[PDB]
């Protein structure tokens, strides 16, 4: 909101904020609705305090209250405080938008493929004696782009699919995989097409934010301590 940095010229350039998942952390095996409601009201308070200044896009995560399969459906209109009714009226979706876990964002003409990282976190749970580092994760994302599918491990990533959206039909400009142990970026060229791959780290540990410049496709990092 420009209160901390106080450089209102540069802060105003951040048009939109994208939350890429894992907004709440809980164990489904032993959890009641009271604690989840408390955490959701905290999140709703943050959203209410920040929505008037910036637009926020919400993406489901693995431990978020959503289905365990990779094509997670958007957050329900409920599970939010009553103060967000105006934002949930239906007409004002440019301020608050709830989208699916894998989603293509056409931000000012720049296509952005974003996933909360269940695919990469799913390939990395195997032991493959033929090939955990930031470079290894970036290479895995490059391989996912090259193979033209987003979920190589179908039995582990996606559930029964009626009637496959994860087989790519078009290459995005930016590829985002979130909830990763480390932050890293790499520009790749597959068949003469340039794709920028970004690894978004968690905020609970290494509370770092990524600033993505849409004009030059350059990603700069902002860190918050305590």
């Amino acid at each position: 909101m420009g209160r901390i940095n106080n450089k209102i010229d540069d802060i105003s350039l951040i048009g939109r904020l994208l939350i890429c998942g894992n907004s709440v952390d809980f164990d489904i095996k032993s959890v009641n609705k009271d604690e989840l409601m408390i955490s959701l009201t905290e999140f709703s308070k943050f959203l209410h305090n920040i929505l008037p200044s910036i637009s926020v896009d919400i993406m489901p995560g693995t431990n978020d209250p959503s289905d365990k399969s990779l094509p997670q459906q958007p957050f329900h209109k409920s599970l939010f405080d009553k103060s967000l009714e105006s934002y949930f009226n239906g007409s004002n979706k440019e301020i608050l938008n709830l989208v699916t876990n894998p989603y293509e964002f056409s931000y000012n003409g720049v296509d952005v493929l974003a996933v909360s990282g269940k695919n990469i976190n799913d390939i990395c749970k195997y032991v493959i004696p033929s090939n955990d580092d930031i470079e290894h994760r970036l290479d895995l994302m490059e391989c996912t782009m090259k193979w033209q599918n987003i979920a190589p491990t179908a039995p582990d990533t996606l559930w029964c699919y009626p009637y496959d959206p994860f087989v790519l039909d078009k290459w995005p400009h930016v590829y985002i995989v979130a909830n990763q142990p480390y932050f890293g970026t790499r520009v790749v060229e597959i068949g003469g097409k340039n794709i920028k791959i970004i690894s978004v780290p968690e905020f609970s540990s290494t509370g770092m934010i990524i600033l993505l410049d849409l004009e030059t496709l350059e990603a700069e990092t902002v860190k918050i301590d305590i």
Partner: protein, 118 residues
């Protein structure tokens, strides 16, 4: 501002034991963040009874927002681009509490899209 921000800080610090943030002054007096930092600095002075623990943060060239804890050795002194009192704490543990803020006219950077009702 003068004789008003000081009274608000004194009340919110001693009458009710609650940490006082500069954003609280922003919401109360409807003033800019720089002015709020100035008033926090002004209240930090002319206080003989240091019954509060000031919380300060340092803004670096790499936008590394850091809470100062050691208060003796601050790494990368030449890299600090801004330093101010973030909050006033009457106790050792900070643990602030947040609620709904009716930011009707306290915004300094408003978003392009306006809210539509019905």
């Amino acid at each position: 501002m003068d004789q008003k921000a000081s009274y608000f800080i004194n009340e919110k610090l001693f009458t009710e034991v609650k940490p006082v943030l500069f954003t609280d002054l922003i919401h109360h007096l409807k003033i800019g963040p720089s002015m709020a930092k100035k008033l926090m600095f002004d209240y930090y002075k002319q206080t003989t009874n240091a019954k509060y623990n000031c919380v300060v943060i340092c803004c670096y060239k790499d936008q590394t927002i850091k809470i100062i804890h050691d208060l003796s050795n601050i790494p990368q002194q030449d890299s600090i681009i801004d330093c101010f009192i973030y909050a006033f704490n009457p106790m050792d543990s900070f643990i602030p509490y947040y609620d709904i803020i009716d930011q009707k006219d306290c915004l300094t950077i408003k978003n392009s899209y306006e809210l539509k009702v019905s």
